[PDB]
Amino acid sequence: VTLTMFSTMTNDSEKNTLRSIADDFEKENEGIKIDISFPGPDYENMLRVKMAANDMPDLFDTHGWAKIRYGEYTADLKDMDWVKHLDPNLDPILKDEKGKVYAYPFNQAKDGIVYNAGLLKKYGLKPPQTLDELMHALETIKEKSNGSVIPFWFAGSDKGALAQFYDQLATPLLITDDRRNEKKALENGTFDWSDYTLLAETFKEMQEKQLINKDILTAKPSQLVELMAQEKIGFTLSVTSIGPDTREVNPDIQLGVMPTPAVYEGDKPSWIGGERHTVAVWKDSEHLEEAKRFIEFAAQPKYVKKIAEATSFPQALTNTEAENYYSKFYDQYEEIKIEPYFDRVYLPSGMWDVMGTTGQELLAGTLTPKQVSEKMKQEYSRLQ
Numbered sequence: 001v002t003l004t005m006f007s008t009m010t011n012d013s014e015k016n017t018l019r020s021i022a023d024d025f026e027k028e029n030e031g032i033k034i035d036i037s038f039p040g041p042d043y044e045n046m047l048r049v050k051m052a053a054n055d056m057p058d059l060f061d062t063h064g065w066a067k068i069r070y071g072e073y074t075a076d077l078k079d080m081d082w083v084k085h086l087d088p089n090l091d092p093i094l095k096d097e098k099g100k101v102y103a104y105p106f107n108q109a110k111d112g113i114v115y116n117a118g119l120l121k122k123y124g125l126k127p128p129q130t131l132d133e134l135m136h137a138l139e140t141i142k143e144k145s146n147g148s149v150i151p152f153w154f155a156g157s158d159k160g161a162l163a164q165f166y167d168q169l170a171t172p173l174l175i176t177d178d179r180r181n182e183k184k185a186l187e188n189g190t191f192d193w194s195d196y197t198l199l200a201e202t203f204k205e206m207q208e209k210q211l212i213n214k215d216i217l218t219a220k221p222s223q224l225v226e227l228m229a230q231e232k233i234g235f236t237l238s239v240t241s242i243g244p245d246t247r248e249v250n251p252d253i254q255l256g257v258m259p260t261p262a263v264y265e266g267d268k269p270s271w272i273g274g275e276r277h278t279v280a281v282w283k284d285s286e287h288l289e290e291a292k293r294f295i296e297f298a299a300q301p302k303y304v305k306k307i308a309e310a311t312s313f314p315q316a317l318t319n320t321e322a323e324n325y326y327s328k329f330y331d332q333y334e335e336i337k338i339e340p341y342f343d344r345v346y347l348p349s350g351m352w353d354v355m356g357t358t359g360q361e362l363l364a365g366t367l368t369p370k371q372v373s374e375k376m377k378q379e380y381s382r383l384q
Protein backbone atom coordinates (compact mmCIF):
# COMPACT_ATOMS: atom_id res chain seq x y z
CA VAL A 1 0.00 0.00 0.00
CA THR A 2 1.24 3.47 -1.03
CA LEU A 3 0.39 6.48 1.15
CA THR A 4 0.21 9.92 -0.44
CA MET A 5 1.68 12.81 1.55
CA PHE A 6 1.61 16.51 0.73
CA SER A 7 3.81 19.12 2.41
CA THR A 8 4.25 22.91 2.16
CA MET A 9 7.99 22.45 2.73
CA THR A 10 10.07 24.34 0.12
CA ASN A 11 13.60 24.07 1.60
CA ASP A 12 15.81 21.37 0.11
CA SER A 13 17.33 20.55 3.51
CA GLU A 14 13.97 20.04 5.26
CA LYS A 15 12.43 18.19 2.33
CA ASN A 16 15.33 15.70 2.18
CA THR A 17 15.19 15.26 5.97
CA LEU A 18 11.47 14.48 5.70
CA ARG A 19 12.25 12.15 2.84
CA SER A 20 14.84 10.21 4.87
CA ILE A 21 12.39 9.90 7.77
CA ALA A 22 9.82 8.58 5.32
CA ASP A 23 12.52 6.17 4.08
CA ASP A 24 13.45 4.92 7.57
CA PHE A 25 9.74 4.26 8.12
CA GLU A 26 9.41 2.33 4.83
CA LYS A 27 12.36 0.11 5.74
CA GLU A 28 10.78 -0.69 9.13
CA ASN A 29 7.29 -1.21 7.66
CA GLU A 30 7.19 -3.84 4.91
CA GLY A 31 3.75 -3.32 3.37
CA ILE A 32 3.98 0.47 3.23
CA LYS A 33 5.45 3.00 0.77
CA ILE A 34 5.22 6.80 1.14
CA ASP A 35 5.10 9.28 -1.77
CA ILE A 36 5.59 12.92 -0.86
CA SER A 37 4.73 15.95 -3.00
CA PHE A 38 6.06 19.44 -2.24
CA PRO A 39 4.10 21.86 -4.59
CA GLY A 40 5.26 24.93 -2.66
CA PRO A 41 3.66 28.06 -4.05
CA ASP A 42 0.80 26.03 -5.63
CA TYR A 43 0.04 24.04 -2.50
CA GLU A 44 -3.01 25.90 -1.19
CA ASN A 45 -4.84 25.85 -4.54
CA MET A 46 -4.03 22.19 -5.08
CA LEU A 47 -5.60 21.35 -1.73
CA ARG A 48 -8.67 23.56 -2.35
CA VAL A 49 -9.21 21.53 -5.55
CA LYS A 50 -8.72 18.25 -3.64
CA MET A 51 -11.13 19.30 -0.84
CA ALA A 52 -13.74 20.35 -3.45
CA ALA A 53 -13.34 16.96 -5.17
CA ASN A 54 -13.11 15.29 -1.77
CA ASP A 55 -10.05 13.31 -3.01
CA MET A 56 -7.42 14.08 -0.42
CA PRO A 57 -3.89 12.85 0.11
CA ASP A 58 -3.60 10.35 3.02
CA LEU A 59 -1.36 12.76 4.86
CA PHE A 60 -1.40 16.49 4.33
CA ASP A 61 -0.02 19.69 5.66
CA THR A 62 -2.55 22.10 7.13
CA HIS A 63 -0.11 25.04 7.28
CA GLY A 64 -2.02 27.23 9.71
CA TRP A 65 -5.58 26.12 8.86
CA ALA A 66 -6.10 22.66 10.49
CA LYS A 67 -9.34 23.59 12.10
CA ILE A 68 -10.73 26.49 10.07
CA ARG A 69 -10.11 25.18 6.55
CA TYR A 70 -9.26 21.49 6.87
CA GLY A 71 -11.26 20.54 9.94
CA GLU A 72 -13.93 18.42 8.27
CA TYR A 73 -11.27 16.50 6.33
CA THR A 74 -9.02 15.53 9.27
CA ALA A 75 -8.99 12.34 11.30
CA ASP A 76 -9.07 12.78 15.09
CA LEU A 77 -5.58 12.12 16.52
CA LYS A 78 -6.43 12.59 20.17
CA ASP A 79 -5.63 9.04 21.22
CA MET A 80 -2.06 9.08 19.82
CA ASP A 81 0.85 9.01 22.28
CA TRP A 82 2.54 12.18 21.09
CA VAL A 83 -0.42 14.36 22.10
CA LYS A 84 0.56 14.66 25.77
CA HIS A 85 3.85 16.26 24.59
CA LEU A 86 2.23 19.09 22.61
CA ASP A 87 3.42 22.52 23.59
CA PRO A 88 0.38 23.99 25.38
CA ASN A 89 0.60 27.17 23.30
CA LEU A 90 -0.78 25.14 20.41
CA ASP A 91 -3.66 23.53 22.34
CA PRO A 92 -6.28 26.03 21.14
CA ILE A 93 -4.93 25.81 17.60
CA LEU A 94 -4.85 22.02 17.14
CA LYS A 95 -7.65 20.97 19.52
CA ASP A 96 -11.31 21.80 19.87
CA GLU A 97 -13.82 21.67 22.72
CA LYS A 98 -14.76 18.13 21.78
CA GLY A 99 -11.17 16.96 22.52
CA LYS A 100 -10.32 16.44 18.84
CA VAL A 101 -6.69 16.75 17.72
CA TYR A 102 -6.61 17.92 14.13
CA ALA A 103 -2.99 17.52 13.06
CA TYR A 104 0.56 16.71 14.14
CA PRO A 105 3.07 19.64 14.09
CA PHE A 106 6.64 19.12 12.86
CA ASN A 107 7.54 22.45 14.33
CA GLN A 108 5.85 25.76 15.15
CA ALA A 109 6.03 29.34 14.00
CA LYS A 110 7.80 32.04 15.99
CA ASP A 111 8.19 34.63 13.30
CA GLY A 112 9.93 37.99 13.28
CA ILE A 113 12.88 39.26 11.28
CA VAL A 114 16.36 37.80 10.69
CA TYR A 115 19.38 39.98 10.27
CA ASN A 116 23.11 40.01 9.91
CA ALA A 117 24.16 40.65 13.53
CA GLY A 118 27.79 41.36 12.64
CA LEU A 119 26.70 43.95 10.08
CA LEU A 120 24.36 45.73 12.49
CA LYS A 121 27.17 45.89 15.06
CA LYS A 122 29.42 47.38 12.37
CA TYR A 123 26.95 50.24 11.84
CA GLY A 124 26.20 50.83 15.54
CA LEU A 125 22.62 49.60 15.12
CA LYS A 126 20.52 47.82 17.73
CA PRO A 127 17.75 45.52 16.46
CA PRO A 128 14.71 47.71 15.54
CA GLN A 129 11.68 47.42 17.83
CA THR A 130 9.47 49.70 15.74
CA LEU A 131 8.68 50.06 12.07
CA ASP A 132 10.13 53.56 12.12
CA GLU A 133 13.34 52.30 13.76
CA LEU A 134 13.52 49.63 11.07
CA MET A 135 13.16 52.25 8.32
CA HIS A 136 16.04 54.18 9.91
CA ALA A 137 18.11 51.01 10.26
CA LEU A 138 17.52 50.41 6.54
CA GLU A 139 18.63 53.95 5.66
CA THR A 140 21.83 53.67 7.79
CA ILE A 141 22.69 50.30 6.24
CA LYS A 142 22.28 51.76 2.74
CA GLU A 143 24.36 54.92 3.19
CA LYS A 144 26.83 53.42 5.69
CA SER A 145 27.76 50.52 3.41
CA ASN A 146 27.48 52.92 0.47
CA GLY A 147 25.03 50.68 -1.38
CA SER A 148 27.15 47.54 -1.20
CA VAL A 149 24.49 45.71 0.82
CA ILE A 150 20.76 45.27 0.29
CA PRO A 151 19.16 46.44 3.56
CA PHE A 152 15.97 44.28 3.30
CA TRP A 153 15.65 41.35 0.87
CA PHE A 154 12.53 39.77 -0.60
CA ALA A 155 12.12 36.88 -3.08
CA GLY A 156 9.34 38.82 -4.77
CA SER A 157 8.77 36.44 -7.71
CA ASP A 158 7.10 34.38 -4.99
CA LYS A 159 3.77 35.97 -3.89
CA GLY A 160 4.00 34.47 -0.41
CA ALA A 161 7.34 36.12 0.16
CA LEU A 162 5.62 39.52 -0.20
CA ALA A 163 2.28 38.61 1.47
CA GLN A 164 4.45 37.61 4.45
CA PHE A 165 5.52 41.23 5.01
CA TYR A 166 1.92 42.52 5.08
CA ASP A 167 0.65 39.64 7.14
CA GLN A 168 3.23 40.04 9.92
CA LEU A 169 2.90 43.83 10.11
CA ALA A 170 -0.90 43.72 10.11
CA THR A 171 -0.64 42.42 13.68
CA PRO A 172 0.99 45.48 15.27
CA LEU A 173 -0.99 47.68 12.83
CA LEU A 174 -4.53 46.38 13.41
CA ILE A 175 -4.55 44.09 16.48
CA THR A 176 -2.09 44.60 19.34
CA ASP A 177 -2.15 48.34 20.13
CA ASP A 178 -5.17 48.52 22.47
CA ARG A 179 -5.41 52.28 21.76
CA ARG A 180 -5.21 51.90 17.94
CA ASN A 181 -6.58 48.64 16.57
CA GLU A 182 -9.48 47.43 14.45
CA LYS A 183 -10.61 44.25 16.17
CA LYS A 184 -14.26 45.30 16.39
CA ALA A 185 -14.60 46.03 12.63
CA LEU A 186 -12.63 42.85 11.85
CA GLU A 187 -15.01 40.82 14.02
CA ASN A 188 -18.04 42.63 12.54
CA GLY A 189 -16.83 41.82 9.07
CA THR A 190 -17.01 45.52 8.22
CA PHE A 191 -13.30 46.37 8.18
CA ASP A 192 -12.69 49.02 5.50
CA TRP A 193 -8.92 48.61 4.95
CA SER A 194 -7.92 52.27 5.14
CA ASP A 195 -5.32 51.49 7.78
CA TYR A 196 -3.71 48.91 5.50
CA THR A 197 -2.52 51.68 3.21
CA LEU A 198 0.31 52.49 5.63
CA LEU A 199 1.81 49.07 4.89
CA ALA A 200 1.66 49.41 1.10
CA GLU A 201 3.06 52.98 1.39
CA THR A 202 5.88 51.64 3.56
CA PHE A 203 6.85 49.05 0.96
CA LYS A 204 6.62 51.68 -1.83
CA GLU A 205 9.07 53.97 0.07
CA MET A 206 11.34 50.96 0.64
CA GLN A 207 11.65 50.54 -3.15
CA GLU A 208 11.70 54.34 -3.69
CA LYS A 209 14.71 54.69 -1.37
CA GLN A 210 16.37 51.46 -2.62
CA LEU A 211 16.06 49.83 0.82
CA ILE A 212 15.23 46.50 -0.91
CA ASN A 213 16.68 44.45 -3.79
CA LYS A 214 16.02 45.92 -7.27
CA ASP A 215 15.54 42.42 -8.66
CA ILE A 216 12.80 41.86 -6.03
CA LEU A 217 10.13 41.05 -8.66
CA THR A 218 12.41 38.44 -10.28
CA ALA A 219 14.20 37.32 -7.07
CA LYS A 220 13.61 33.71 -6.10
CA PRO A 221 13.95 32.01 -2.74
CA SER A 222 16.99 30.07 -4.15
CA GLN A 223 19.16 33.14 -4.23
CA LEU A 224 18.90 34.28 -0.63
CA VAL A 225 21.36 31.94 1.11
CA GLU A 226 24.11 32.96 -1.33
CA LEU A 227 23.76 36.67 -0.56
CA MET A 228 23.30 36.32 3.19
CA ALA A 229 26.36 34.02 3.15
CA GLN A 230 28.46 36.75 1.55
CA GLU A 231 27.25 39.59 3.81
CA LYS A 232 25.25 41.47 1.14
CA ILE A 233 22.00 41.41 3.15
CA GLY A 234 20.95 43.28 6.30
CA PHE A 235 17.45 41.90 6.97
CA THR A 236 15.05 39.17 5.83
CA LEU A 237 11.76 37.88 7.17
CA SER A 238 12.65 35.11 9.63
CA VAL A 239 10.42 32.57 7.83
CA THR A 240 13.02 32.25 5.03
CA SER A 241 14.88 29.85 7.45
CA ILE A 242 18.34 30.51 5.95
CA GLY A 243 20.50 30.34 9.11
CA PRO A 244 21.04 26.59 8.81
CA ASP A 245 22.09 26.67 5.17
CA THR A 246 24.01 29.94 5.18
CA ARG A 247 26.04 28.62 8.17
CA GLU A 248 26.94 25.46 6.25
CA VAL A 249 28.22 27.88 3.55
CA ASN A 250 29.87 30.34 5.95
CA PRO A 251 30.30 29.56 9.68
CA ASP A 252 31.63 33.09 10.38
CA ILE A 253 28.13 34.67 10.17
CA GLN A 254 26.39 35.75 13.36
CA LEU A 255 22.72 35.95 12.46
CA GLY A 256 20.19 37.25 14.94
CA VAL A 257 16.45 37.00 15.20
CA MET A 258 14.11 39.71 16.51
CA PRO A 259 10.33 39.84 16.86
CA THR A 260 8.02 41.57 14.41
CA PRO A 261 8.38 45.25 15.39
CA ALA A 262 5.56 47.39 16.78
CA VAL A 263 4.02 50.17 14.62
CA TYR A 264 2.64 52.59 17.17
CA GLU A 265 4.71 54.14 19.94
CA GLY A 266 3.88 52.51 23.27
CA ASP A 267 3.03 49.21 21.58
CA LYS A 268 5.41 46.30 21.88
CA PRO A 269 6.76 43.87 19.29
CA SER A 270 5.17 40.48 18.79
CA TRP A 271 6.30 37.02 17.76
CA ILE A 272 3.87 35.55 15.23
CA GLY A 273 3.07 31.93 16.16
CA GLY A 274 0.91 28.96 15.28
CA GLU A 275 1.30 26.09 12.85
CA ARG A 276 4.11 25.97 10.33
CA HIS A 277 4.53 22.44 9.03
CA THR A 278 2.00 19.83 10.05
CA VAL A 279 0.62 16.57 8.86
CA ALA A 280 -3.03 15.64 9.25
CA VAL A 281 -4.55 12.29 8.28
CA TRP A 282 -7.44 12.23 5.84
CA LYS A 283 -10.49 11.13 7.78
CA ASP A 284 -11.53 9.06 4.74
CA SER A 285 -8.13 7.48 4.05
CA GLU A 286 -8.21 3.83 3.04
CA HIS A 287 -5.03 3.37 5.10
CA LEU A 288 -5.91 5.36 8.24
CA GLU A 289 -3.91 3.12 10.55
CA GLU A 290 -0.79 3.08 8.38
CA ALA A 291 -1.05 6.84 7.98
CA LYS A 292 -1.11 7.23 11.77
CA ARG A 293 1.79 4.82 12.11
CA PHE A 294 3.87 7.25 10.06
CA ILE A 295 3.03 10.02 12.45
CA GLU A 296 3.87 7.89 15.49
CA PHE A 297 7.20 6.90 13.87
CA ALA A 298 7.93 10.58 13.03
CA ALA A 299 7.16 11.73 16.59
CA GLN A 300 10.04 9.73 18.08
CA PRO A 301 12.53 11.88 19.92
CA LYS A 302 15.25 11.20 17.33
CA TYR A 303 13.17 12.15 14.29
CA VAL A 304 11.68 15.13 15.98
CA LYS A 305 15.26 16.26 16.49
CA LYS A 306 16.18 15.66 12.85
CA ILE A 307 13.21 17.57 11.51
CA ALA A 308 13.71 20.26 14.13
CA GLU A 309 17.27 20.90 13.00
CA ALA A 310 16.43 20.96 9.25
CA THR A 311 14.93 24.42 9.90
CA SER A 312 15.44 27.30 12.31
CA PHE A 313 11.79 26.95 13.38
CA PRO A 314 11.13 26.10 17.01
CA GLN A 315 9.88 22.71 18.11
CA ALA A 316 6.23 21.81 18.69
CA LEU A 317 6.69 19.13 21.36
CA THR A 318 8.03 19.47 24.88
CA ASN A 319 9.61 15.99 24.81
CA THR A 320 12.75 17.00 22.89
CA GLU A 321 15.71 17.63 25.17
CA ALA A 322 17.11 19.84 22.39
CA GLU A 323 17.13 23.63 22.52
CA ASN A 324 15.47 25.73 19.83
CA TYR A 325 17.83 27.20 17.24
CA TYR A 326 17.38 30.80 18.39
CA SER A 327 16.76 30.05 22.11
CA LYS A 328 19.51 32.60 22.86
CA PHE A 329 17.52 35.51 21.45
CA TYR A 330 14.21 34.15 22.78
CA ASP A 331 15.61 34.48 26.30
CA GLN A 332 16.50 38.07 25.34
CA TYR A 333 12.85 38.68 24.35
CA GLU A 334 11.08 36.62 27.05
CA GLU A 335 8.87 39.71 27.47
CA ILE A 336 7.43 39.52 23.95
CA LYS A 337 4.02 37.87 23.51
CA ILE A 338 3.00 35.51 20.71
CA GLU A 339 0.28 36.50 18.27
CA PRO A 340 -1.42 34.30 15.69
CA TYR A 341 -1.06 35.13 12.00
CA PHE A 342 -3.40 37.93 11.06
CA ASP A 343 -4.75 36.23 7.94
CA ARG A 344 -5.26 32.88 9.72
CA VAL A 345 -7.69 34.07 12.33
CA TYR A 346 -8.97 37.53 11.33
CA LEU A 347 -9.71 36.99 7.60
CA PRO A 348 -11.56 34.54 5.38
CA SER A 349 -9.53 31.93 3.46
CA GLY A 350 -8.37 33.52 0.18
CA MET A 351 -6.92 36.76 1.48
CA TRP A 352 -3.32 35.42 1.52
CA ASP A 353 -3.11 35.19 -2.29
CA VAL A 354 -4.59 38.68 -2.64
CA MET A 355 -2.04 39.96 -0.14
CA GLY A 356 0.78 38.56 -2.28
CA THR A 357 -0.70 39.45 -5.67
CA THR A 358 -1.30 43.06 -4.65
CA GLY A 359 2.19 43.26 -3.11
CA GLN A 360 3.58 42.45 -6.57
CA GLU A 361 1.47 44.94 -8.46
CA LEU A 362 2.39 47.69 -5.95
CA LEU A 363 6.06 47.01 -6.69
CA ALA A 364 5.42 46.82 -10.47
CA GLY A 365 3.45 50.08 -10.30
CA THR A 366 0.07 48.68 -11.43
CA LEU A 367 -1.47 49.84 -8.10
CA THR A 368 -0.87 52.75 -5.73
CA PRO A 369 -0.90 52.00 -1.97
CA LYS A 370 -4.56 53.28 -1.80
CA GLN A 371 -5.55 51.03 -4.71
CA VAL A 372 -3.96 48.09 -2.87
CA SER A 373 -6.24 48.65 0.13
CA GLU A 374 -9.14 48.92 -2.37
CA LYS A 375 -8.44 45.53 -3.92
CA MET A 376 -8.14 43.91 -0.46
CA LYS A 377 -11.55 45.39 0.53
CA GLN A 378 -13.15 44.27 -2.71
CA GLU A 379 -11.93 40.70 -2.25
CA TYR A 380 -12.66 40.65 1.50
CA SER A 381 -16.30 41.56 0.82
CA ARG A 382 -16.51 39.04 -2.02
CA LEU A 383 -15.35 36.39 0.45
CA GLN A 384 -18.56 37.10 2.45
Ligand SMILES: OC[C@H]1O[C@H](OC[C@H]2O[C@H](OC[C@H]3O[C@H](O[C@]4(CO)O[C@H](CO)[C@@H](O)[C@@H]4O)[C@H](O)[C@@H](O)[C@@H]3O)[C@H](O)[C@@H](O)[C@H]2O)[C@H](O)[C@@H](O)[C@H]1O
Pocket (backbone or CB within 6 Å): 008, 009, 010, 011, 040, 041, 042, 043, 044, 063, 064, 065, 155, 158, 159, 160, 161, 162, 164, 167, 221, 239, 240, 241, 341, 343, 344, 352
Ligand atom coordinates in the same frame (compact mmCIF):
# COMPACT_ATOMS: atom_id res chain seq x y z
O1 LIG B 1 3.55 32.41 6.78
C1 LIG B 1 2.19 32.81 6.95
C2 LIG B 1 1.32 31.97 6.03
O2 LIG B 1 1.43 30.61 6.46
C3 LIG B 1 0.69 29.67 5.67
O3 LIG B 1 1.17 29.66 4.34
C4 LIG B 1 1.55 28.40 3.81
C5 LIG B 1 2.58 28.71 2.74
O4 LIG B 1 3.12 27.50 2.18
C6 LIG B 1 4.16 27.75 1.23
O5 LIG B 1 5.24 28.48 1.85
C7 LIG B 1 5.78 27.73 2.90
C8 LIG B 1 7.27 27.95 2.97
O6 LIG B 1 7.45 29.27 3.45
C9 LIG B 1 8.81 29.63 3.53
O7 LIG B 1 9.41 29.84 2.24
C10 LIG B 1 9.23 31.00 1.41
C11 LIG B 1 10.56 31.57 0.96
O8 LIG B 1 11.26 31.89 2.15
O9 LIG B 1 8.51 31.98 2.17
C12 LIG B 1 7.22 32.16 1.57
C13 LIG B 1 6.12 32.33 2.60
O10 LIG B 1 6.34 33.51 3.38
C14 LIG B 1 7.00 30.94 0.71
O11 LIG B 1 6.05 31.12 -0.35
C15 LIG B 1 8.38 30.62 0.22
O12 LIG B 1 8.52 29.24 -0.13
C16 LIG B 1 9.54 28.74 4.52
O13 LIG B 1 10.89 29.10 4.52
C17 LIG B 1 9.37 27.27 4.12
O14 LIG B 1 9.88 26.41 5.11
C18 LIG B 1 7.90 26.99 3.98
O15 LIG B 1 7.74 25.63 3.65
C19 LIG B 1 3.64 28.58 0.06
O16 LIG B 1 4.71 28.82 -0.86
C20 LIG B 1 3.11 29.90 0.62
O17 LIG B 1 2.63 30.78 -0.40
C21 LIG B 1 2.01 29.59 1.62
O18 LIG B 1 0.96 28.90 0.95
C22 LIG B 1 -0.78 30.01 5.64
O19 LIG B 1 -1.51 29.13 4.79
C23 LIG B 1 -0.99 31.45 5.18
O20 LIG B 1 -2.40 31.69 5.26
C24 LIG B 1 -0.15 32.42 6.00
O21 LIG B 1 -0.63 32.52 7.34
